Enzyme design. Structure first.
Site, PDB file in Angstrom:
ATOM      1  N   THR A  13       0.797  -1.199   0.000  1.00  0.00           N
ATOM      2  CA  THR A  13       0.000   0.000   0.000  1.00  0.00           C
ATOM      3  C   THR A  13       0.850   1.278   0.000  1.00  0.00           C
ATOM      4  O   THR A  13       0.425   2.296  -0.473  1.00  0.00           O
ATOM      5  CB  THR A  13      -0.988  -0.057   1.172  1.00  0.00           C
ATOM      6  OG1 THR A  13      -1.900  -1.178   0.947  1.00  0.00           O
ATOM      7  CG2 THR A  13      -1.745   1.270   1.302  1.00  0.00           C
ATOM      8  N   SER A  48       1.329  -7.610  -0.258  1.00  0.00           N
ATOM      9  CA  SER A  48       2.119  -8.548   0.497  1.00  0.00           C
ATOM     10  C   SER A  48       1.257  -9.734   1.000  1.00  0.00           C
ATOM     11  O   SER A  48       1.801 -10.731   1.492  1.00  0.00           O
ATOM     12  CB  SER A  48       2.820  -7.874   1.640  1.00  0.00           C
ATOM     13  OG  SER A  48       1.964  -7.696   2.789  1.00  0.00           O
ATOM     14  N   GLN A  49      -0.052  -9.624   0.881  1.00  0.00           N
ATOM     15  CA  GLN A  49      -0.883 -10.808   1.041  1.00  0.00           C
ATOM     16  C   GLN A  49      -0.580 -11.914   0.029  1.00  0.00           C
ATOM     17  O   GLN A  49      -1.018 -13.064   0.251  1.00  0.00           O
ATOM     18  CB  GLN A  49      -2.363 -10.476   0.970  1.00  0.00           C
ATOM     19  CG  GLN A  49      -2.876  -9.932  -0.397  1.00  0.00           C
ATOM     20  CD  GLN A  49      -2.959  -8.444  -0.441  1.00  0.00           C
ATOM     21  OE1 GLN A  49      -1.999  -7.775  -0.062  1.00  0.00           O
ATOM     22  NE2 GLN A  49      -4.145  -7.897  -0.837  1.00  0.00           N
ATOM     23  N   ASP A  80       0.861  -6.461   5.468  1.00  0.00           N
ATOM     24  CA  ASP A  80       0.153  -7.741   5.866  1.00  0.00           C
ATOM     25  C   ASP A  80       1.139  -8.876   6.254  1.00  0.00           C
ATOM     26  O   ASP A  80       0.935  -9.577   7.262  1.00  0.00           O
ATOM     27  CB  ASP A  80      -0.767  -8.179   4.745  1.00  0.00           C
ATOM     28  CG  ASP A  80      -1.845  -7.169   4.457  1.00  0.00           C
ATOM     29  OD1 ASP A  80      -1.962  -6.154   5.192  1.00  0.00           O
ATOM     30  OD2 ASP A  80      -2.608  -7.419   3.508  1.00  0.00           O
TER      31      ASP A  80
HETATM   32  N1  LIG Z   1      -1.147  -1.497   3.996  1.00  0.00           N
HETATM   33  C1  LIG Z   1      -0.719  -2.505   3.195  1.00  0.00           C
HETATM   34  O1  LIG Z   1       0.414  -2.560   2.762  1.00  0.00           O
HETATM   35  C2  LIG Z   1      -1.695  -3.663   2.980  1.00  0.00           C
HETATM   36  C3  LIG Z   1      -1.544  -4.326   1.635  1.00  0.00           C
HETATM   37  N2  LIG Z   1      -2.581  -5.378   1.529  1.00  0.00           N
HETATM   38  C4  LIG Z   1      -0.210  -5.038   1.572  1.00  0.00           C
HETATM   39  O2  LIG Z   1       0.198  -5.707   2.546  1.00  0.00           O
HETATM   40  O3  LIG Z   1       0.488  -5.034   0.565  1.00  0.00           O
END
Ligand SMILES: NC(=O)C[C@H](N)C(=O)O
Ligand SMILES: NC(=O)C[C@H](N)C(=O)O
Ligand SMILES: NC(=O)C[C@H](N)C(=O)O
Ligand SMILES: NC(=O)C[C@H](N)C(=O)O
Ligand SMILES: [Mg+2]
Ligand SMILES: [Mg+2]
Lengths: 316, 331, 316, 331
Positions: A13, A48-49, A80
């Site tokens: 993000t 990163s999920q 994540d």
């Molecule tokens: N705030 C973030 O970075 C969440 C995003 N889903 C990630 O981990 O890439």
């Protein structure tokens, strides 16, 4: 006379997810020029999920190969699974120059976006000579956190990242760090894990415990011939009876079994309700299930013997 | 003249480390659910100052082996015996207390207090926490002010609501906390100053009626992490599970493999709730997942094990994802 | 072949307050014989709310004189000012053998009394050779905490003691400690404070800030010729205008002035709203007001110069 | 057809780091209360999506210099202007926000929302927190569900009640927490899920009426520690203070010198409230101090600065220690 700092970008993000390129990220914080000469390289651009073993191995080899070309590294990454990648690099990186991971809870375009000052502070940390030899670090919310104990504690709070068992290493104020702690657990060049010639990691899965837990997840891992299974136990790493029976079997059938806990702080201990020695199980200590997986995968590149695995779990 | 009369409080015992024992006061080894309720009561001589206590041993297990049938037995017993007593304390293990507490929060219709209690050290250990915890749980169950707050957990001098309460540490006597919305009250010298009550509907304000149920819908939980396997999710789908709860990364996100399996499942009528492995904060709608599109439900502040509780109960009323979402917004 | 451990008793609710003698305390935990040969000495028998400079100086000299006679020290003490005494001894003790402070939230006679296992765990800690050279320690609620960062966080909770900025050093489970941290700030034999021939300490008082704060407390200290004044500031060590004017004067009139904060965690920093250099003030860092007093009293035995005092505040 | 209408929200600005500025985006030096309310509003362009905002600059100070007269000006203004607006946001410094918030919690009679907001980084700093905080405070003040919860503080995506809320860290943007009873609600995507409301009486349920008051009773605070001086307490007593709050050690205990001075004072009619320097938990009755005997009051969970607020207001009604104790048990 400013440090040479390399940004390895992976997504997240901070770059929102995983859409904006490393060049844009750097250019959006022109004050970075006050503190370092920053070179950026794009590794991947993902949420990163969807982080995985291939990315991990890529990062470890890239940092190890390029160590002597730079003064420090900053890795932009999703929140994540930041704690999993930090710990993997903590154990496999052989560069003792600063390696600092950073993300953001809000994108570039949101009100009061946290990524710019986050990145600024991460470069401050990577440029400080005092940051060296503390292992792989996560810098979020003006705090420097070791990669072993750091974890995300809240689903949306900018202050999510905390070292929940042993606390942070230092706080950042006005571009300076007062370091008061360093991890005692062996890291980076004090570990035997060597990933330079590896193209895959041992297969380790994670099963959850809860009331009336199904044994079907654990069975599906055993049936696929998984190298290791981490249990996210209840309380002090305990297992629901069905899960305990299937994992007892796995551990005498070629699958290493690590008991961790779904409980967010504290050690999964030996000498409580479970006779680890008898079942051939390893207790994870303060490593949470996702972190225990990291170390179990690496332990499995050296050994399958549970007594030797427990010893690894007691040193790294 | 008038005479003081002490409330009648029933202890329903289920086991737990509160009833655990080991061979040394000073070693950590113990075995669970070994000591009967009578022994617990007699280890707190001062209980006579505050209540007329009667104990019943419902089962004697580690809460690591808690299950649907024990949940049904407890709720039915409390609802049946309501008129016979002034309040209930449930002695229980720590490990899954937060699950049983929420189940009872949603299914007890008795509006006398229901207070759960456990211990982090066995009954045999030095400085055992169980005795005063039990004393405090009886204080709470006897307090008129405790009524209509839902099912409660009392530990370490603190009264916690069964919805938000969770265990935060593997060994610390202070482990139990309501990590998102905080406790209801604190106990000092046998007295409670209550300053909060849970807004979410509980007890006789929910539609969930387990009086005739002899089983619950099948709901499994899968964990997300880097390189997560889809095999657990697939195993649950192959077994015809009515629901699956995802322990997501960050704000309830899923590894792509897991996401694919659960989306497919949801299209065939499996209820899928997104929760989070992260220990505090809501799994929200309107984040990275289009829940409407996939037929998924967002768990809010319910952690994976608590979302399973509400999902199983939801599935007794409806299999529609919009109606399940409204349940997760109201209870 | 068991360690020789000395209990120095001072009072507190662990001995309730301050009524039961050290011999009784020891005899009530007969399992202490499994882990050490324990000798007990009564220093005082007081509630730690009445702790004072004379007791501090007594303890420091007693430990320093008797260092080579024993393998470790346990100090039984009240909870209320445990954090002040721990830090004083942290800076003045020259024994590098373990010195461990312990108390209790509940008396001996209360249900689920915490003092016996507390004392057991404190002797475990004092007997562990790994405990040496970590400075003066507080052991409460199965946790080993450094004397600089430890503080009481709740008025009645048995788990009150926490190292709120940098976290604990180790957790105690089954009579064993997994140490993962040590204080980086200079302690014990790495400090120049030497109290061996001192019979009193410089006079340092503490004033509180809040809305519409009266300057009368600060004035009464200045009028008595106090050696130092610590401000319990609001936020990042800020001062109510009246208080700021009186302290500005004090600092140019022979009273060292330290800005700390009433806020329970985080550093009182330089380079925020207050020009410390201009007013001759010292910023306390993460030292809370009562801890800042400790160090300011000791700094005043070496120097009155605020620049040198700030340097002390940056090293200890 | 119908048209959507946006609520009318008034920003009463008082200064604070939210209105602070420094010469670099990346250095920590700044000066406070330098930027006017108009500048703040225009730094949050999206405010037009959610409210019709009007600003008024009441004063422009660091909250470190907050004082009784500003408190009286605010309460009177809110109570006078109630009918003219749908809600109020108060921009304010962090340092004493928890004091002003509780004062207003006890003296506003308007039952439209009153929301306080500040920032930990100045308006000029990189990643400044003030803009979204202000946006979130407007969300909260515009939300019908926010009414009748007392005076609120909104910071870091969280809605906190003015009684329990306090600043916990010197620099962290997450500093504001309700450390004993937790927050009321969390804000995600411009929406609040409220799950709590404070039980203690606030706003139009208190007797405290400041409409005609042009000053407040004099109340000082003294700190306890090892070897504590009695000189501060004596100075307050020599000046004829109406009340003194003790920042006690542990559960509100006092160093003997301080105790002696305050006991003497209380016998001559000074109100003395025991609070605690310890950052969480109640200063209780029935501990080491015989409060009845000395004419002292126990503060409960009120920290020293908050106890001062309620003591000053209490002293406007009564000087009797039993009646002051009942006030500290009810508000
Ligand atoms: N705030 C973030 O970075 C969440 C995003 N889903 C990630 O981990 O890439
Ligand atoms: N502390 C405890 O009660 C742990 C135990 N395994 C239980 O949950 O039954
Ligand atoms: N629990 C305690 O020890 C409190 C007591 N007032 C003391 O500090 O001595
Ligand atoms: N963060 C802040 O607002 C601090 C400032 N001194 C204030 O209270 O006005
Ligand atoms: Mg009669
Ligand atoms: Mg029209």
């Amino acid at each position: 006379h400013l440090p040479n700092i390399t940004i390895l970008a992976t997504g997240g993000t901070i770059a929102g997810v995983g859409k904006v390129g490393v060049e844009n990220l750097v250019n959006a914080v022109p004050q970075l020029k006050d503190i370092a000469n920053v070179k950026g390289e794009q590794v991947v651009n993902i949420g990163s999920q969807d982080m995985n073993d291939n990315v991990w191995l890529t990062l470890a080899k890239k940092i190890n190969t390029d160590c002597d070309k730079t003064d420090g590294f900053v890795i932009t990454h999703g929140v994540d699974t930041m704690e999993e990648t930090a710990y993997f690099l903590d154990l496999t990186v052989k560069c003792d120059k600063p390696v600092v991971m950073v993300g953001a809870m809000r994108p570039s375009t949101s009100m009061s976006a946290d990524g710019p000052f986050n990145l600024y502070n991460a470069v401050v940390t990577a440029a400080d000579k005092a940051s060296a030899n503390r292992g792989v670090l996560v810098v979020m919310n003006d705090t420097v956190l070791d990669g072993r104990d750091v974890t995300t504690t809240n689903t949306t709070d900018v202050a999510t990242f905390k070292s929940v068992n042993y606390g942070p290493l230092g706080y950042i104020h006005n571009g300076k760090i007062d370091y008061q702690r360093t991890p005692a657990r062996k890291h980076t060049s004090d570990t035997p894990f060597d990933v330079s010639k590896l193209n895959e990691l041992p297969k380790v899965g994670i099963v959850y415990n809860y009331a009336n837990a199904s044994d079907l997840p654990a069975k599906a891992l055993v049936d696929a011939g998984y190298d290791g299974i981490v249990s996210a136990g209840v309380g002090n790493g305990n297992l629901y009876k069905s899960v305990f029976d299937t994992l007892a079997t796995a551990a005498k059938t070629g699958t290493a079994v690590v008991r961790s806990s779904r409980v967010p702080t504290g050690a999964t201990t030996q000498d409580a309700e479970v006779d680890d020695a008898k079942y051939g199980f390893v207790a994870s200590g303060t490593l949470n299930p996702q972190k225990a997986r990291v170390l179990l995968q690496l332990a499995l590149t050296q050994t399958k013997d549970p007594q030797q695995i427990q010893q690894i779990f007691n040193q790294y």
